[PDB]
Amino acid sequence: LKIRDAYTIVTCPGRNFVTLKIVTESGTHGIGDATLNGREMAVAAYLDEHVVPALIGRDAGRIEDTWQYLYRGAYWRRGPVTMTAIAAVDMALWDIKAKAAGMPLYQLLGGKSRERVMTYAHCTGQTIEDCLGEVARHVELGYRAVRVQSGVPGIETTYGVAYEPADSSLPAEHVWSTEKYLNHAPKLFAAVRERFGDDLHVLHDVHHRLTPIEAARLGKAVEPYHLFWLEDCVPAENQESLRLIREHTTTPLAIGEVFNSIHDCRELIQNQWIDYIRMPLTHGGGITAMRRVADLASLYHVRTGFHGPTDLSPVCLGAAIHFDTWVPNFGIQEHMPHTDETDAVFPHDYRFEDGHFLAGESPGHGVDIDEELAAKYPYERASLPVNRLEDGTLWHW
């Protein structure tokens, strides 16, 4: 019942992961993802020094109380380090509760709303032709949906083209030209449609680099290609940033992988400025908070599109697949396969087949951590890149 022990595990089976483990007096345990790419040790310290000591002796079944205790109790509310710490606890407690209930997590949430969970794959290449080759191979793999990114002529490096974003100890320095990208990007989607037809879902990630009127122009330009979404058009700390885009294009819009709170997107949703909300479990306060975000989204026809990169661990992925299985307003689940070393450290029972995930049936979220294996891979610092304009201006990566 009560929490006997709680501790973090930091491991680098291909890239860094931070995991919270919670053990009850009865011996049942649960785990939560706590990985915050490029800032990992900040969450590890938040948990180790400040949260973990407060968890000892608490009733593990008190999920809601623990969430509020950590969210309100921190005094300094919201934020990526804060909410990732809270998310790790929350995921671990839901894991415990589902185990206690003898049910897979999706059953505890209200049962399945779908028989499988559609994903998309990253297709990338230096030239449009290179990208098209990748689309072909993934379609052969059974993917119904692909994200397409390709190099921009006249730009040395562009987002999503070589791919492990955090591939340097210190931030790599990329250079950017918005105008060259705006002129080129539509050619990628035209080429994809010409070769692969209309049935395929095609996604694109603008990755924060445009101003709103620039994103409006781009949305308009890509209307003929019927994208599944155009993602992260503009930095959105000021939520009104989406308004001009929405008023000028019918290309569907996705945002929110960089968010950690319903307060980051309440207006985006209520004003109907987006079609997909991307904030995932480990950065968005866990199951407890994301259920609330998804529900708000549902009132406005907005669907979930969980961020699912390699820098969220299989713990997040398994939990996410359970959530995806239940949530009425599911949109899509992003999939970037983990390394074999990562998969082995995090035994799990979710399955991928024919372009879709199937939720596990084991009690809990179905993921565990092999601590002794984890210990074979010590932490290695790795930072996300920064992006600069051609004049040296520090821009948005």
Locate 105 and state its tokens.
């997590």
* Closer Cβ to ligand GCO, 173 or 370, answer by number: 173
The mark string for 253-292 relative to Mg ion (x by CB under 5 A, - otherwise) is: ----x-----------------------------------
Q: What is the DSSP letter of 172?
A: P
Structure tokens belonging to residue 141: 């793999």
| 76 in contact with a copy of itself (CB under 8 A) | yes
**In the complex, what is the shortest distance from the CB of residue 358 to Mg ion, in angstroms, rounded to a whole number?**
25
Establish whether 207 is a catalytic residue. Answer: yes
| Residue 386, helix vs strand vs coil | strand
In terms of C-beta density within 10 A (0-12 exposed, 13-18 middle, 19 or more buried), how is residue 338 classed? buried
Among positions 40, 48, 205, 214, the unique one binding Mg ion when judged by CB under 5 A? 205
Distances (CA, A) of 58 to 52, 53, 285: 11, 10, 19
| Rounded CA separation 137/234 (Å) | 31
Helix (H, G, I), strand (E, B), or coil: what is residue 83? helix
Catalytic residue among 207, 208, 283, 348: 207
* CB 89 within 8 Å of CB 65: no
CB atoms within 10 A of CB 347: 14
Query: Which one of the spans 45-53, 102-110, 189-197, 343-351 is the region binding a copy of itself (CB under 8 A)?
Result: 45-53
Give the x/- contact pattern for a copy of itself in 313-342, rule: CB under 8 A.
Answer: ------------------------------
Quick note: the x/- pattern for a copy of itself over 145-184, rule CB under 8 A, is ------------------------xxx-------------
Among 2, 26, 68, 354, binds a copy of itself (CB under 8 A): 68
Give the count of beta carbons closer than 10 Å to the beta carbon of residue 355. Answer: 20
Closer residue to Mg ion, CB minimum distance, 257 or 264: 257
Among 1, 2, 5, 53, binds a copy of itself (CB under 8 A): 53
Question: By C-beta, is 37 or 282 nearer to ligand GCO?
Answer: 37
**Smallest gap from residue 378 Cβ to a copy of itself (A):** 14
Among residues 115, 116, 117, 93, which one has the least CA distance to residue 105?
93
- Distance between CA 314 and CA 31 in Å, rounded? 11
Contact 88, 32 (CB under 8 A): yes
Site residues (CB under 8 A) for a copy of itself, limited to 214-253: 235, 237-238
Please confirm, yes or no, whether 46 is among the known catalytic residues.
Answer: no
Q: Which residues are catalytic?
A: 159, 207
- Residues at the annotated binding site for Mg(2+)? 205, 231, 257
